[PDB]
Amino acid sequence: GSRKIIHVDMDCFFAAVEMRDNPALRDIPIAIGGSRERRGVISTANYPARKFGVRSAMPTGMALKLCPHLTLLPGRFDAYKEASNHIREIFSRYTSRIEPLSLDEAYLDVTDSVHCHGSATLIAQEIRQTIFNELQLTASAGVAPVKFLAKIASDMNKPNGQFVITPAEVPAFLQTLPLAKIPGVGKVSAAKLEAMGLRTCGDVQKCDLVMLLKRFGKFGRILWERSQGIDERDVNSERLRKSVGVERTMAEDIHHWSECEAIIERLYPELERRLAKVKPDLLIARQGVKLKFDDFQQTTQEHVWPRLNKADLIATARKTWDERRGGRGVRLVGLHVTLLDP
DNA sequence: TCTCGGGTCCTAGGACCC
DNA sequence: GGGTCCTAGGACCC
Ligand SMILES: Nc1nc2c(ncn2[C@H]2C[C@H](O)[C@@H](COP(=O)(O)NP(=O)(O)OP(=O)(O)O)O2)c(=O)[nH]1
Numbered sequence: 001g002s003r004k005i006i007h008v009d010m011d012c013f014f015a016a017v018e019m020r021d022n023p024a025l026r027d028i029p030i031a032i033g034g035s036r037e038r039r040g041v042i043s044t045a046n047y048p049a050r051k052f053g054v055r056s057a058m059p060t061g062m063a064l065k066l067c068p069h070l071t072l073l074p075g076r077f078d079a080y081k082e083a084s085n086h087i088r089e090i091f092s093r094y095t096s097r098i099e100p101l102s103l104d105e106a107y108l109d110v111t112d113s114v115h116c117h118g119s120a121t122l123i124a125q126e127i128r129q130t131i132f133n134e135l136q137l138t139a140s141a142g143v144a145p146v147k148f149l150a151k152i153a154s155d156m157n158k159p160n161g162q163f164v165i166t167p168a169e170v171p172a173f174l175q176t177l178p179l180a181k182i183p184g185v186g187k188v189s190a191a192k193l194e195a196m197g198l199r200t201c202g203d204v205q206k207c208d209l210v211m212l213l214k215r216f217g218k219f220g221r222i223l224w225e226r227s228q229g230i231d232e233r234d235v236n237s238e239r240l241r242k243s244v245g246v247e248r249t250m251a252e253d254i255h256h257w258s259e260c261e262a263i264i265e266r267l268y269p270e271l272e273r274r275l276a277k278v279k280p281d282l283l284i285a286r287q288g289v290k291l292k293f294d295d296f297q298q299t300t301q302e303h304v305w306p307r308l309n310k311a312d313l314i315a316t317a318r319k320t321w322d323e324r325r326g327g328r329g330v331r332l333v334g335l336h337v338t339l340l341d342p
Numbered sequence: 343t344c345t346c347g348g349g350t351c352c353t354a355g356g357a358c359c360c
Numbered sequence: 361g362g363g364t365c366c367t368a369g370g371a372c373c374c
């Protein structure tokens with residue numbers, strides 16, 4: 001009853017495609033992200049820039065303090081999508097059991113695949129080669145019997161490598177595995193678990209499920225299962241998008257509704273075009289708005305509504321702006337829809 | 343350094359249905 | 361009293 005899962009993850013994705021496309025970027029530190037005047041964060045960085053401490057999600061101000069020669073790119077989304085499509089077309093050559101998690105990443109279930117004497121190890125290696133040939137980009141991969149461990153596997157010899165975990169290896173692997181490396185356990189959760197004296201999967205194995213259920217709910221069952229190596233989640237292939245949103249962060253906090261309103265007018269065309277792309281009639285389940293203040297509270301107002309409408313989005317943004325700003329500057333405005341179900 | 347924009351899934355109270 | 365819808369927010373991931 002053992003499956004074979006591969007997680008494939010491109011290396012330094014956005015930056016890899018920039019450096020391929022312009023090689024003077026290879027050995028100098030670069031990153032894709034908004035400028036510090038635009039109040040941006042880093043989307044990603046290349047290895048020369050990570051060496052200085054630059055990471056995804058870091059404020060751009062902080063990146064340039066740390067790495068003052070940082071060349072900042074705005075990023076070219078069609079180029080990244082062109083590459084993404086090609087790599088999924090490549091995965092398709094080996095199986096149809098494909099679950100993408102982003103542009104750069106996917107799970108494959110190759111249990112019932114006959115491509116390299118049924119070797120998951122060899123299949124992954126053949127996919128990383130071939131991606132390298134063809135795209136001149138490099139990928140890493142993790143091979144394992146369940147999703148989470150393939151994904152964790154894939155970070156252990158990156159860049160441009162891969163790592164396998166056999167069922168026989170799983171237990172020693174879990175013993176000292178930090179809970180924080182499990183997907184879905186982030187900062188807030190890791191620190192709650194540390195406070196109870198739980199750092200690794202090992203520690204959690206010595207724990208009562210019933211208590212994990214009391215302290216954390218469905219998530220506590222997931223921890224318990226994941227600590228044991230249990231992950232019965234199946235590679236899907238049928239996932240579909242459920243919402244589309246658009247939001248922008250102004251270089252300067254804004255203080256008057258005239259300014260907010262001017263911001264929405266710019267937002268709405270972008271949201272209408274993105275939504276037309278997958279729903280030409282513009283029919284939806286709900287639409288709504290979002291503001292984020294000065295001090296990072298953030299509220300949303302969203303309701304049932306049958307078709308994208310600009311003025312209603314302006315109405316609500318007005319109410320929301322009257323009723324829950326209280327004199328704080330606003331750093332971002334956003335719009336949003338929830339897509340019909342089937 | 344001062345904190346993005348695209349999403350996903352989980353929770354939870356009161357409404358509403360039976 | 362027990363489902364399921366409706367809304368808002370939070371944690372998380374890429
Ligand atoms: N806007 C934004 N984009 C991001 C963020 N994180 C990632 N991206 C975009 C930019 C990334 O290029 C891409 C894939 O994300 P990863 O696989 O998490 N990291 P990469 O592939 O860059 O590095 P590694 O070699 O360690 O895999 O997604 C973020 O916080 N914000």
Ligand SMILES: [Mg+2]
Nearest residue numbers: 009010011012
């Ligand atoms: Mg990657």
Ligand SMILES: [Mg+2]
Nearest residue numbers: 009102104105
């Ligand atoms: Mg990824």
